[PDB]
Each structure stands twice: as C-alpha cells, then as structure tokens.
Design a protein around this ligand. Structure first.
Ligand code: CHL
Ligand code: CHL
Ligand code: CHL
Ligand code: CHL
Ligand code: CHL
Ligand code: CLA
Ligand code: CLA
Ligand code: CLA
Ligand code: CLA
Ligand SMILES: CC1=C[C@H](O)CC(C)(C)[C@H]1/C=C/C(C)=C/C=C/C(C)=C/C=C/C=C(C)/C=C/C=C(C)/C=C/C1=C(C)C[C@H](O)CC1(C)C
Lengths: 213, 210, 229, 217
C-alpha cells in the first residue's frame, strides 16, 4: 500500500510506515531490534540535519567562489579561515568539543531517560528541554515558531520533508567528496563543465570512475 | 509578591520579600534571600555597608569640592586614593592598630545585640546609662538618635536611609571603577563630562583605551 | 471574506478575527495561538517602523536630494558624536521597548505613568495602546485597523524595494522611478540581469564595499549579492 | 535530588537516607567505590581530611602569590619555597620532617582511634582532663569542641549550609592543587603567571597550545 523502495517486495515487519520516510528499506535488517531502531532514527536525523547545513554551506560558498566574491572552495576553507584570521586550530577544536560535548551529552541522556533534562538542573530551564518525540525535541528553544505544536497534519508533512531532504543532502555530501576526489575541482565548477558539455563531460569520461573506459 | 512597589512593574516578585524590610522592591533575581536566616544576616549587612558607604562618599566628595573652591587646609587637593600615603601625626600602622582595637569593642557590642536583641543596651561602666528597651538590630536609637527623629514616620525614614545608602554604595563602586579607568578624581571626571557630555561617555573613553 | 487567492480555502486557524486576515499563512506559521500572538505584534511593529522609514526616505530625498538615504549615516554630521547619539537612543529605546514588551507578557501591567500616578492608559489590546497615544480617531477604529495593516504591508515591501534598488542602481527611490520612466523596457531587473543554463549575468553592487567614518572603516556589504539574479 | 549528570542512574548506595545525609552527595560514584557502607564511612572521613588540607595548602599558595604579584609580599613560588626556607632555617629538612611525623602521627592516631570507635578519646583519665573535650560530636569528621572555638556548629539552622560550603570549597581546592602541579610541569611558571598569561591572549595561550596536554593535535 505505502510506496516501497523496491516495488513488489513486501515491507519488513519492523517497518510499519509509522516513522517518517518509511519506505521499507532495511535489507540487512539492521533496525530489526526496536531500541536499536530508535537509536538509528536519531542517528539518521542527526546525520541528515548536519548534511543539510553542510550542503547549503558548500553550495553558497561555492556560488560566491563561482562569482568574484573571494569565497574559498569547501576543501580549502579550513586553512583560509585559520591563516587569514590567525585562529589557533587546537583552541577552536577543543572549544567545539566543549560545546558539542555539552549539547550531545544532554541529548544522549534524554534518549537514555526521556524528559530527564527538564528537571530545572540547567539554569532552571524546564520545558525547553523535555522533548516531544525521539529525534524531535520541540519546545520554545528548538522549535521557536511552534510549527510542531500547531496543525498535527502539517507537523507530519514537515517531518516527511525533513527526512527526505536530509537523505538527499547526505547523498549530496558523498557526491561532493567523490567529485572532488575524482576531478580536483569545486562542485559548481563540475556543474558548469557538465552543463557546457553534458555528453562529453561526465563521470564516464573523468578517467577514474570507470577504469576500463 | 503583593501590591508593594516593584523594580519591574508587572513581574511576579519572590514571596519571601513581603515588605517587612525597608526598600523591599522584590529585587532578588538570583534568589539569595530565599532562605530566612541568610536574609536576616543580609538585611544587617546591607544596612552596615550602606552606612559606611554613605560616610565614605561624603568624605570623598566634600573635600574635593572644597579643594576646587578656595577652601585651604592640610588636605587641600589630596586625592582620596592618595590619602593613605599622606604623612599624618602618627604612622599609618599605629593608627590602624588603634582603629582595630576601638572597632573590636563596638562591633562585638553591635554583634551581641544582633544575636540577642536588647542584650547590649546598657553602659558597662556607668550601668545607670542605657538605651530604650524597644530596639531592633541595626537601629540602636537612644543616644544614637539624640534628636528623636525615630519617633516620627520611622518607616519612611528607614526607606530614605536604604535608598540613600544603595546610591552611596553604587557611588563608591563608581569612584573605584572611574579612578582605575580614568586615573583621575571623581569631580574631575564630572567636569570632563559636563564640558562635553556627548564626547565623554564610558563607551568612547574605553574605545580610545583599546 | 476577501482572500489573497480568490476561490481558495483559508487555513483553519485563519478564521477572520484579526485585521488584515486574507487567509494567507501557506507555511502554517500562525497555527499556534501563543506564536500568533507574538507574530501579530511583530507585524504591527514592522509595519509602523517601515511606514515611517518609507515616508522619511522619500521626504528626505525631496527636501535633501543631494543626500542619498543609503549614505546618510556617514554623511549626516551633528555636534552630538555618533556614540553620544547612540547612547541616548539606546536608553530611550530600551525603556519604550521593555514597557511595550511587558504589555505583551502581562497585559494591563504597564498602562500607569511611573512618574505621575494620575495618568493611566484605559484597558486596551496589545499592539493598540490608545489613550494618550491616540488623541484623535478619524472614523471606525476597526476600519483604520485594516487601513493600518494594509498600508503597513505595502510599506514593508517598499523599503525592501528601496534597499535593493539602492544596491542595484545606487539611487534613491525617486531617482530610480525616473530612470525606469525614462526607459522602462531597459530599466526593469529583467533588463538588468539574466540567468540561462549556459551563463549567469547579475547587476554589480553600486555600494562601496567599506566606508571610512571617523577612522573606523565600517563594513558595508550588499545583500546576498552571490544569489543576485 | 541534585545529580552530577542529569538523567543518569544514581547508585542506590548514594540514594540511601544515610548517604543522603552526607554533604556533597550529588550521586557521583561511577566506579562503585562506596557501595560498602563501612568503606563509604572511611572514604567520607578521607574526603574531609583531603578537603581541609587542600584548602589550607592552596590558600597558602594562591593568597601569598597574589600578594607577591601585587608587592605586599615577596614569597617565592610554591615549588621553590622549600629550598628557600630550609636555606636559612635552624634545622635541616630531615630533622624538621622527623619532628613533623612524630607530632602528626600522635594527633592522627587519636583521630584514627576516634574513627574506629567514636568518643573513645574521651576515655576518663587518658589526657590530663582534656579527654573530656577530645570526645567529638555525634557526626564523625566534625569534632567541634576546641576545634570550633566560635561555636558556629551550634546553630542547627545553619549546620547543613556550612558543611556543603566546606565540601564544595574543599573539592575545588583539591582540583586547584592538581591544576598547580599539572600547570607547573606543562608551563615552567607559577599559577599567578599562568593566569595573567592566559588573560592576555586566552585564544592562543592555553593547554591546547602548551605542546604537552594534547600531543595529538
Ligand atoms: C564531580 C564530577 C563531575 C563530573 C565528572 C561531571 C561530568 C559531567 N557533567 Mg556534571 N559532572 C560533575 C559534577 C557536577 N555536575 C553538576 C551539574 C551538571 C549539570 C546540570 C549538567 C552536568 C553535565 C555534565 C556532563 C557535561 C558534558 C560535557 O561535555 O561537558 C563539558 C562542557 C563544558 C561547557 C565545559 C565547561 C567549561 C570548561 C571546563 C572551560 C571553562 C572555560 C570558561 C571560559 C571559564 C571562565 C571563567 C571566568 C570567566 C570566571 C559531564 C559528563 C551536563 C550533562 O551532560 O548532563 C546530562 C549537564 O547538563 N553536570 C553538578 C552540580 C549539581 C556537579 C557537582 O556538584
Ligand atoms: C566535519 C567534517 C570535516 C571534513 C570532511 C573536513 C575536511 C577537510 N578539512 Mg577540515 N574537515 C572537517 C571538519 C573540520 N575541519 C576543521 C578545520 C580545518 C583546518 C584548519 C583545515 C581543514 C582542512 C580540511 C581539508 C584537508 C584534508 C584534511 O586535513 O582533512 C581532515 C579531515 C578528514 C580527513 C576527515 C574529517 C572527518 C570525516 C579537508 C577537505 C585543511 C584544509 O582546508 O586544507 C586546505 C585545513 O588546513 N579543516 C574544523 C574546525 C577545527 C572542523 C570541524 O570542527
Ligand atoms: C575600604 C578601605 C580602604 C580602601 C578601599 C583603601 C584603598 C587604598 N589605600 Mg588604604 N584603603 C583602605 C583603608 C586603609 N588604608 C590605610 C593605609 C594606607 C596607606 C598607608 C596607603 C594606602 C593606600 C591605598 C590605595 C592603594 C591601595 C594599595 O595599597 O594597593 C596595593 C595593595 C593591594 C592591592 C592589596 C588605595 C586606593 C596607598 C596610597 O594612598 O597610595 C597612593 C598607601 O600608601 N592606605 C589604612 C590605615 C589607616 C586603612 C584603614 O584603616
Ligand atoms: C536601525 C536601522 C538602521 C538601518 C536599516 C541602517 C542602514 C544603514 N546604515 Mg545606519 N542604519 C540603521 C541605523 C543607524 N545607522 C547609524 C549610523 C550609520 C553610519 C555611521 C553609517 C550607516 C550606514 C548605513 C548603511 C550601510 C549598510 C551597511 O553596510 O550596514 C552594515 C552594518 C554593519 C556592518 C554594522 C553591524 C551590523 C548591524 C549594525 C548589527 C546589529 C546587531 C545588533 C546590535 C544586535 C545602511 C543603508 C553606513 C553608510 O552610510 O553606508 C554608506 C555608514 O557609514 N549608519 C546609526 C547611528 C545613530 C543608526 C542608529 O540607529
Ligand atoms: C604535600 C607536601 C609536599 C609537597 C607536595 C612538596 C613538594 C615539593 N617539595 Mg617539599 N613538598 C612537600 C612537603 C615538604 N617539603 C619539605 C621540605 C622541602 C625542601 C627543603 C625542599 C622541598 C622541595 C620540594 C619540591 C621539589 C620536589 C622534591 O624535592 O621531591 C620530593 C617531594 C615530595 C615527595 C612531595 C610529595 C609528597 C606526597 C605526595 C605525600 C604523600 C616540590 C615541589 C624542594 C624545593 O623547593 O625545590 C626547589 C626542596 O628543596 N621540600 C618538608 C619538610 C620541611 C615537607 C613536609 O611536609
Ligand atoms: C562582517 C564582515 C563581512 C563581510 C566583509 C562580508 C562579505 C560578504 N558576504 Mg557576509 N556575513 C557576515 C559578514 C561579512 N560578510 C556575517 C557576520 C554573516 C552571518 C549573518 C554573513 C552571512 C552571509 C551570507 C548568508 C552571505 C554572505 C555573503 C557575502 C558576500 C556578498 C555580499 C554580502 O555581504 O552578502 C550579504 C550577507 C550578509 C549576512 C550581510 C550582513 C552582514 C553584516 C556585515 C553583519 C555584520 C555584523 C558585524 C557586527 C559586523 C560578501 C563578499 C553572500 C555570499 O556568500 O555570496 C556568495 C551570502 O549570501 N554573508
Ligand atoms: C567610613 C567613614 C569615613 C572614613 C573611614 C573616613 C576616613 C578619613 N577621612 Mg573622613 N569624612 C567622612 C567620613 C569618613 N572619613 C564624612 C561623612 C565627612 C563629611 C565631613 C568627612 C570629611 C572629611 C574631611 C574634610 C577630611 C576627612 C579626612 C579623612 C582621612 C584622614 C582623617 C584624619 O586625618 O584623621 C581623623 C580626624 C578626626 C578623627 C577628627 C581618612 C582616611 C581628612 C583627610 O583625608 O585629609 C587628608 C580630611 O581632610 N574626612
Ligand atoms: C549613581 C552612580 C554613578 C554615577 C552617578 C556615575 C556618573 C558618571 N560616571 Mg560612572 N560608574 C558607576 C557609577 C556611577 N557613575 C559604577 C557603579 C561603575 C562601575 C564600577 C562606573 C564606572 C564608570 C566608568 C568606567 C566611567 C564612568 C563615567 C561617569 C561619568 C560620565 C560618563 C558615563 O556616564 O559613564 C557611564 C556610567 C555608567 C554606565 C554607570 C551607570 C550609572 C549607575 C549604574 C547609576 C544607574 C542609573 C540610575 C538611573 C542613576 C543615575 C544617576 C542619578 C544621579 C541620576 C559620570 C559623571 C565615565 C567617566 O569617568 O567620565 C569621564 C567613565 O568612563 N563610570
Ligand atoms: C524611523 C524613522 C526615521 C529615521 C530613523 C530617520 C533618520 C534620519 N532622518 Mg528622517 N524623516 C522621517 C523619519 C525618519 N528619519 C519622517 C517620518 C520624515 C517626514 C516628517 C522625515 C523627514 C526628514 C527630513 C526632511 C530629513 C531627515 C533627515 C534624517 C537623517 C538625519 C537627520 C536627523 O535625524 O537628525 C536629528 C533628528 C531630530 C533632532 C528630530 C528629533 C525627532 C523628533 C523631533 C521626535 C519625533 C519622535 C517620534 C514621535 C517617534 C516615533 C517615530 C517612529 C519612527 C518611531 C537621519 C538618518 C535629514 C537628513 O536627511 O539629513 C541628511 C533631513 O533633511 N528626515
Ligand atoms: C569521587 C570519585 C568516585 C568515582 O567512583 C571514581 C573517581 C572518579 C576516581 C573518584 C574521583 C576522585 C578524584 C577526582 C580525586 C581527586 C583527588 C585530589 C585532586 C586530591 C588533591 C589533594 C591535594 C592536597 C591534599 C594538597 C595539599 C597541599 C599542601 C599540604 C600544600 C603544601 C605546600 C604549600 C602550602 C606551599 C609550599 O611552598 C609548598 C607545599 C609544601 C607544597
């Protein structure tokens, strides 16, 4: 009934169409055990949301590089920022692990004990850290505009768009790495080359993807 | 948490602040006086720090203002932060030694009253002399109120005392900051501002020092 | 009830109670009641600020044509230095904004004058102070509440036009209208920019990149220039 | 219940009412060292002595150091003060330590026997009339009596707060001493210099840039 990844093949039992983006895809039954499935749900959402920010960051800075605005390529930005701004790499990295560490550990213990981060232990904040659902921590800090607490159907549709856009961005970031490794150029340089010659400038003629070509 | 004056009109004030202390505007954003035994100690502390700050600010600004005018005397243009190194009749050390002895007697006499109200209202030597029974820690009265003011609107007078003290405590804090930042006396700092207020804000001053 | 798209069904949350309700909430931003209460005030504040800015920028261009509004901050010179002017602005706006905010957080808790006890705003609605702030009302208040929102939504969209026109043409609102009226077929953005699969063409930023002001050098960037058509 | 880690499972041995009566109980014993009540009692005594020694020592390193930095003092750095003091002393270090162990061992033995049996040091006729005061209080590790000259422990409405400040300030001073040792080995300077240097350029002067703490980055 629900569209599946391989039309004609019955959906796995541990996939009942309840989760957003449920197309019955678990060929290696990695999410067969429930608690494991809940963990993987937060994992896909966390991976996907970072990929969406990543992809949008690379695309904008790549546009600024395509035009004459002086934005470094994604694979060269890390060195430009540290060099031009004389920023100490070790300090920045440790600061990140401090901030991410705090946010990740609080998200981790919310998964282990749902609602346990809304006791007021953190500066007396209670409701902003209770969490609505696994991988969906609404409230007034994370959902400042209330889109999750208004129109249940709109919330379900938004969840479908989020997971699908996140899986697309995760595929796009794997594409940005593979294309840079195979071509040595930027992503919007690759799109301009293809658009110029789509039949003669593609992966089949890159001299790397197909070794016998 | 009633209809008494508030530091932020419209806010839910702490219930523990009920308007029994002077200047109760419900201001305890960090919930320090939530515990009653701490609040009891903090009330006296605020009154003591206020009463010394009021005397200090007076004794810091009056001499400076007299200095600006033709008033002549040993101190003259002595900056408050330079008064310690000034040469007096006795060595600083000696004076400090006397100060700590003299204060040990009065502070422990005041402290006795606070721990047991009306326990130190009698002259140890001239036993006959004493303070009127009706007494609250922080308000000894008797020979400490030689003109009878306490008899009149005491609550208003206590609110005027706390208000003037909080402003004095903030003034002294200013003197400390402005002196360490502008490296000059307070009435000089005020003259600089009154000459060109627009171009004499802490923002511009600190920006220049950066 | 008139709607933004004739023949369409408005969002269930958009019944028609609020002024300016033409059933327009495609993203569902106002389906939460407490969120709608904030956005309603935000739309009013944005509207009134934009209406005054669009009026001021047009008048400033007529009275002071030589001065381009975009370059006014650096050009306007007063004896009250930039910092002195800002300090005064900061304190005055902090007070008015907190007073207005507290009205939204606790309605009816800030209608009393804090210096004169004899003066208090009558019971009212958030976004509509009235009282001393409303000495005269020329007509039905409900009708003017529709006029205010409609004239405000147009002004908010005009300002954004003045900004983009300034960065694309380097001219004030009137000077642009005249450029367009001189050659409409060659003055529209379509006649200034064009993106096709083969190539991309965008009008250049006509705003200096940095301004030198009282020995500071203020960064002055164009808006999302990289994504410009 | 305050928790060292909101949402974590508190050990049942730290949720027991007697354990909750202990100051500084934030449910922190990830290694399960105090599961045994008798051990928890010895470790509570051990934590109190470490806290009170660290607070006294750290105060004797920071306070003199700041005063010297100002000028009010000329004390040598904590890691150089032994050599400076023994240089012009009346006794060599070995004699001074021998006398220390004798006097410390005696008072440490009396405290020890008080842990083995609380109130034992009040044994009548054991200390020329002082044994009466040598009996502590109902709370082990809180002798009071002559050790509380101002009788602050006599105010039951302030007892808990006072003990919490002692444990939290003690745990901080214990970590401040470990920091003084680590920073000395990683910097070659004193704790007051380390503070001033970091405050001058915090983004480039830290343990990530010391060339020791993070040998991987
Ligand atoms: C005694 C040992 C002890 C240990 C080992 C931990 C360990 C931890 N606690 Mg915990 N706590 C401990 C005691 C206590 N905690 C708390 C209260 C909490 C709360 C409320 C929370 C934790 C949390 C955490 C975790 C934070 C995760 C992270 O990456 O943080 C590192 C993150 C940082 C931001 C590091 C902090 C700053 C860094 C040390 C450098 C400081 C730089 C500053 C510029 C300092 C400048 C000062 C100047 C300007 C004055 C973590 C595993 C958090 C958690 O994950 O809970 C699930 C959390 O929310 N603890 C209390 C009081 C009740 C404790 C003791 O009394
Ligand atoms: C989160 C993913 C992530 C990825 C995929 C990369 C990828 C890259 N980083 Mg980078 N970084 C990443 C995070 C971060 N970097 C930096 C800071 C820097 C600097 C300062 C530099 C790079 C550099 C580089 C590039 C050179 C190869 C390298 O050393 O890679 C290391 C990373 C990986 C091999 C894998 C990363 C995890 C999967 C490369 C494309 C260099 C560069 O731009 O060269 C021109 C460079 O100099 N990064 C920070 C902040 C501290 C990051 C995260 O916090
Ligand atoms: C609230 C009380 C109080 C305050 C705020 C100050 C503040 C000050 N005293 Mg001072 N004093 C105070 C009480 C007393 N002093 C002195 C005796 C002195 C002397 C003899 C000197 C000062 C000096 C100073 C200034 C230099 C500070 C200093 O030594 O820095 C360095 C030390 C630390 C930061 C610690 C300074 C502004 C000095 C001064 O006037 O310099 C121009 C100075 O020479 N004071 C006595 C004894 C009667 C005091 C109380 O009894
Ligand atoms: C409140 C709205 C407001 C708006 C929309 C503008 C808009 C503008 N100002 Mg103006 N200003 C505003 C208020 C004020 N300005 C000035 C003082 C100036 C000066 C002196 C200058 C401008 C300039 C400009 C123009 C250059 C744009 C630019 O690159 O800015 C980008 C702004 C920055 C990079 C600064 C940081 C961004 C923003 C201020 C952050 C705000 C953060 C929050 C405080 C939180 C521009 C159209 C410049 C000009 O003339 O252009 C040629 C210029 O030199 N303004 C004052 C002082 C009283 C203001 C007070 O409210
Ligand atoms: C917790 C106590 C304690 C600590 C941590 C130190 C630490 C130190 N002492 Mg010191 N001492 C201590 C107690 C004592 N010292 C001395 C007498 C001296 C002298 C005369 C000298 C030192 C010196 C030193 C430093 C050189 C290290 C050393 O000689 O290795 C041995 C150090 C230890 C074994 C300490 C570790 C103790 C352990 C953790 C406790 C169990 C060093 C930082 C030397 C110095 O200052 O060099 C410039 C030096 O010349 N100490 C005496 C007897 C009076 C102590 C009595 O308790
Ligand atoms: C403060 C220095 C600074 C400078 C010199 C620039 C310069 C530039 N930015 Mg910008 N940017 C900045 C800060 C700065 N940025 C900050 C702080 C942010 C976070 C909000 C951004 C976010 C940003 C975005 C999203 C984009 C740019 C883009 C660009 C390029 C197109 C012109 C533009 O300004 O777009 C306008 C974008 C802005 C955010 C303008 C607002 C920035 C002002 C200066 C706030 C600074 C406040 C601070 C107190 C000073 C251009 C070279 C565009 C680009 O990448 O081209 C491909 C682009 O789309 N920037
Ligand atoms: C906490 C309250 C307080 C404290 C601690 C001080 C402390 C001090 N004052 Mg005083 N002063 C105060 C309140 C206070 N003042 C008030 C309320 C006034 C209002 C008149 C003054 C007016 C005043 C003047 C005019 C002068 C001082 C001076 C002094 C300094 C030396 C006084 C002296 O030479 O021997 C003590 C003198 C007697 C006991 C008599 C000294 C540091 C003198 C000074 O610093 O000259 C260098 C000085 O000129 N004070
Ligand atoms: C009632 C206390 C009080 C008063 C009347 C003043 C007055 C003055 N200060 Mg100031 N100051 C104070 C406290 C105070 N200060 C405190 C507590 C500090 C922190 C320690 C400072 C630190 C400070 C610095 C660094 C500087 C000044 C400076 C100044 C002068 C003008 C520049 C300026 O406005 O800077 C800004 C002052 C502040 C932002 C402090 C806020 C004022 C306090 C909090 C009162 C709160 C406002 C309230 C409505 C009361 C108003 C005063 C009342 C009499 C009407 C001016 C005469 C500047 C100067 O020296 O000029 C040459 C200067 O650079 N002050
Ligand atoms: C948000 C509204 C706004 C803002 C930020 C500005 C800002 C500016 N205007 Mg302007 N203006 C506005 C509205 C505004 N105007 C309106 C509505 C009109 C039509 C009446 C004008 C007509 C106008 C002219 C004719 C000129 C300016 C000029 C200027 C520039 C310098 C003059 C100056 O402000 O000196 C100081 C301003 C004053 C001392 C006046 C004080 C403010 C009055 C007296 C109080 C009114 C308070 C009001 C009730 C508050 C609600 C307003 C609302 C926006 C919140 C400056 C950047 C001048 C310029 O372009 O310089 C090159 C200039 O020639 N404006
Ligand atoms: C609880 C828990 C539980 C779970 O289960 C697990 C775990 C985690 C393991 C645990 C934890 C633990 C810890 C953290 C510990 C730490 C400790 C310390 C740091 C101590 C110090 C400690 C420290 C201390 C005592 C200190 C001491 C010091 C002193 C005396 C001083 C001395 C001196 C001075 C004055 C000066 C001179 O010139 C020199 C000298 C001679 C040097």
């Amino acid at each position: 009934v629900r569209p599946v990844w391989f039309p004609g093949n019955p959906p796995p039992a541990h996939l009942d169409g309840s989760l957003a983006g449920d197309y019955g895809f678990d060929p290696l039954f990695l999410g067969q055990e429930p608690q494991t499935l809940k963990w993987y749900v937060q994992a896909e959402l966390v991976h996907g949301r970072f990929a969406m920010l990543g992809a949008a960051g690379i695309i904008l800075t790549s546009i600024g590089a395509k035009v004459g605005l002086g934005f470094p390529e994604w694979y060269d930005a890390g060195k430009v920022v540290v060099e031009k701004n004389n920023i100490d790499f070790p300090t920045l990295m440790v600061i990140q692990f401090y901030l991410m560490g705090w946010a990740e550990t609080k998200r981790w213990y919310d998964f282990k004990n749902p609602g346990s981060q809304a006791d007021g232990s953190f500066l007396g904040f209670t409701e902003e850290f209770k969490g609505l659902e696994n991988g969906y921590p609404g409230g007034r800090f994370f959902d400042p505009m209330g889109l999750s607490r208004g129109d249940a159907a709109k919330y379900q549709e938004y969840k479908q768009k989020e997971v699908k856009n996140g899986r697309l961005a995760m595929i796009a970031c794997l594409g940005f790495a593979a294309q840079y490794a195979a071509t040595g150029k930027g992503p919007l340089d690759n799109l301009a080359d293809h658009l110029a010659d789509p039949n003669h400038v593609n992966f089949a003629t890159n001299g790397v993807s197909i070794p016998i070509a | 948490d009633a209809a008494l004056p508030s530091w932020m009109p419209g806010a839910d004030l702490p219930g523990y602040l009920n308007g029994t202390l002077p200047g109760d505007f419900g201001f305890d954003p960090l919930y320090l006086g939530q515990d009653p035994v701490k609040l009891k100690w903090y009330a006296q502390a605020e009154l003591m720090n206020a009463r010394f700050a009021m005397l200090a600010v007076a004794g810091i600004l009056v001499p400076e203002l007299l200095s600006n005018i033709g008033f002549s005397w040993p101190g003259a243009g002595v900056a408050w932060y330079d008064a310690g190194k000034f040469e007096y009749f006795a060595p600083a050390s000696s004076l400090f030694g006397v100060q700590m002895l003299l204060f040990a007697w009065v502070e422990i006499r005041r402290y006795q009253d606070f721990v047991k109200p009306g326990s130190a209202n009698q002259d140890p030597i001239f036993t006959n002399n004493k303070l009127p029974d009706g007494n609250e820690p922080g308000y000894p009265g008797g020979i400490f109120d030689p003109f009878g003011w306490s008899k009149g609107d005491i609550k208003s007078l206590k609110l005027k005392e706390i208000k003037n003290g909080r402003l004095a405590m903030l003034a002294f804090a200013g003197f400390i900051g402005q002196a360490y930042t502008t490296g000059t006396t307070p009435l000089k700092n005020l003259s600089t501002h009154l000459a060109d207020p627009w171009s004499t804000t802490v923002w511009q001053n600190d920006l220049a020092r950066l | 009830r008139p709607l933004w798209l004739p023949g369409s069904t408005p969002p269930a949350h958009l019944k028609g109670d609020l002024p300016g309700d033409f059933g327009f909430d495609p993203l569902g931003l106002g389906a939460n009641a407490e969120s709608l209460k904030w956005f309603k005030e935000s739309e009013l504040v944005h509207s009134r600020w934009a209406m005054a800015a669009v009026a001021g920028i047009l008048v400033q261009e007529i009275v002071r044509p030589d001065v381009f509004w975009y370059n006014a901050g650096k050009e306007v010179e007063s004896p009250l230095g930039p910092l002195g002017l800002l300090a005064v602005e900061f304190f005055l706006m902090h007070w008015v904004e907190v007073r207005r905010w507290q009205d939204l957080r606790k309605p009816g808790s800030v209608d009393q004058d804090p210096i004169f006890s004899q003066y208090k705003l009558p019971p009212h609605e958030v976004g509509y102070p009235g009282g001393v702030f409303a000495p005269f009302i020329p007509g039905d208040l409900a009708e003017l509440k529709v006029k205010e929102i409609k004239n405000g939504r147009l002004a908010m969209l005009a300002f954004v036009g003045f900004v983009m026109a300034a960065q694309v043409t380097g001219k004030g609102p009137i000077a642009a209208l005249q450029e367009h009226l001189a050659d409409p077929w060659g003055t529209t953005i379509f006649s200034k920019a064009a993106v096709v699969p083969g190539q991309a063409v965008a009008p250049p930023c006509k705003i200096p990149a940095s301004v030198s002001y009282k020995g500071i050098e203020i960064p002055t960037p164009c808006f999302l220039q990289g994504l410009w058509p | 219940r305050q928790s060292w880690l909101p949402g974590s499972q508190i050990p049942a041995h730290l949720d027991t009412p007697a354990a909750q009566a202990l100051a500084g109980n934030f449910g922190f014993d990830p290694l399960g060292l105090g599961k045994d009540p008798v051990a928890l009692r010895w470790y509570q005594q051990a934590e109190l002595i470490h806290c009170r020694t660290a607070m006294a020592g750290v105060a004797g390193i920071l306070i003199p150091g700041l005063l010297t930095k100002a000028g009010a003092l000329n004390v040598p750095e904590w890691y150089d003060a032994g050599k400076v003091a023994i240089e012009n002393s009346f006794a060599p270090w070995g004699s001074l330590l021998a006398v220390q162990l004798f006097l410390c061992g005696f008072v440490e033995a009396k405290r020890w026997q008080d842990i083995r049996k609380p109130g034992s040091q009040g044994e009548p006729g054991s200390f020329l009339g002082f044994e009466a005061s040598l009996k502590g209080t109902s709370e082990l590790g809180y002798p009071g009596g002559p050790f509380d000259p101002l009788g602050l422990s006599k105010e039951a409405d302030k007892w808990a707060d006072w003990k919490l400040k002692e444990v939290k300030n003690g745990r901080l001073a214990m970590l401040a001493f470990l920091g003084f040792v680590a920073q000395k080995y990683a910097t070659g300077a004193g704790p007051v210099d380390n503070l001033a240097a970091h405050l001058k350029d915090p983004w480039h002067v830290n343990y990530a840039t010391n060339g020791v703490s993070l040998p991987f980055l």
